[PDB]
Each structure stands twice: as structure tokens, then as C-alpha cells.
Write a protein that binds this ligand. Structure first.
Ligand SMILES: O=C(O)c1csc(-c2ccc(C(F)(F)F)cc2)n1
Length: 172
């Protein structure tokens, strides 16, 4: 995946977030540090928060990341699209896990109720464990794909089943 897309992936709370533009940051609601009153030097006062379940979008009143260009954010992707989940792991290793995307789903995973776009990992027979599949620390990592000549972001990592095969992308 292009270096600009990896540059946008930021360590945040108990997981990750993603800079869509110089002023727009998306992440998975449950990774947000619950007591936090200040983000990237800005008070809440200066920030527009849009929260729908496990998807959260922060819009800032000034350019936090002026090095970036604004890219396309869509509400999930057509069934059958292959995405990459842009996962950073211990030591500057970059793990773009391939997922075939499915339907909008409601699920119960480790007891909690989860809603978003379901997918099946294309990394192995099952994706149990950190080598072929996701771990709780990956939450907030972006789901991206290339369409003709540009790249689209269409959600953030919210959950994965015990077997690991099934993942859920929270969507705008
Ligand atoms: O809508 C919600 O608040 C929601 C849906 S699932 C969820 C969630 C998942 C995992 C965890 C973790 F602590 F285990 F990481 C904590 C909350 N929150």
C-alpha cells in the first residue's frame, strides 16, 4: 500500500486512528481514552465529534496534518470488494491484511453487540493468532482499496471473531 496511506495511520488510545485530510481524523469509538479533554494540542471546544456506534469522526478547527491531501471516505464498499486493513505491528513491521468484504451485519462477539460491514480474511484457513489475523490492539486500523487510479478509505477495524476468520469494519 502507498507510503502516504501508512503516514496517516496514528497510534491513538488503546489502538489506532487515520487522517482522512489535514482536519479530519477517524477511529473506533472504544479505543478513545475516556477521560481525554485535549487532542493534538486542541481542546474539545475546537473540535466537532460525529459518533455513530463504533465509528467516530473528529473535525478540527485548524490543520493538524498540513502535510496530507484530503482523500475519499465512503460508507463501506460494495459486497465482494477486496480491502487491505493497514495494521502496524511491533517494530516498524507493516501488515496490510487482505479481506473480502460482505454485508452490513449485527453480531455478538465475546459477549458485546457489534454493528458494521462484515468481511472474511484471505490470509489463511483460519486467522487465529497474531501471524495471520487481528489482535485487540489493531482496532481503529483503516480499511482501504484502490479503485481505478485512486485509493478509498471505507471504515475502521472494530472487531473479530474467536476463530479470527470474520472481521467487522465500523462505517460512517
Ligand atoms: O457501541 C459500543 O460502545 C461498543 C460496541 S462493541 C464495543 C467494545 C468492544 C471491545 C471493547 C474492548 F474493551 F474489549 F476492547 C470495548 C468495547 N463498544
Amino acid at each position: 500500500a502507498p507510503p502516504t496511506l501508512w503516514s496517516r495511520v496514528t497510534k491513538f488510545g488503546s489502538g489506532w486512528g487515520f487522517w482522512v485530510s489535514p482536519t479530519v481524523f477517524i477511529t473506533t469509538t472504544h479505543v478513545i481514552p475516556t477521560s481525554a479533554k485535549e487532542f493534538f494540542g486542541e481542546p474539545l471546544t475546537s473540535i466537532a465529534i460525529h459518533r455513530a456506534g463504533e465509528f467516530t469522526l473528529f473535525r478540527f478547527s485548524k490543520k493538524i496534518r498540513p502535510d496530507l491531501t484530503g482523500m475519499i471516505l465512503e460508507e463501506g464498499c460494495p459486497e465482494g470488494t477486496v480491502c487491505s486493513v493497514l495494521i502496524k505491528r511491533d517494530s516498524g513491521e507493516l501488515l496490510p491484511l487482505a479481506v473480502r468484504m460482505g454485508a452490513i451485519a449485527s453480531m455478538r462477539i465475546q459477549g458485546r453487540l457489534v454493528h458494521g460491514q462484515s468481511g472474511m480474511l484471505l490470509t489463511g484457513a483460519n486467522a487465529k493468532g497474531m501471524d495471520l489475523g487481528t489482535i485487540p490492539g489493531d482496532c481503529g486500523a483503516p480499511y482501504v482499496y484502490k479503485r481505478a487510479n485512486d485509493w478509498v478509505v471505507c471504515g475502521v477495524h472494530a472487531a473479530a471473531t474467536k476463530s479470527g476468520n470474520t472481521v467487522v469494519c465500523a462505517v460512517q
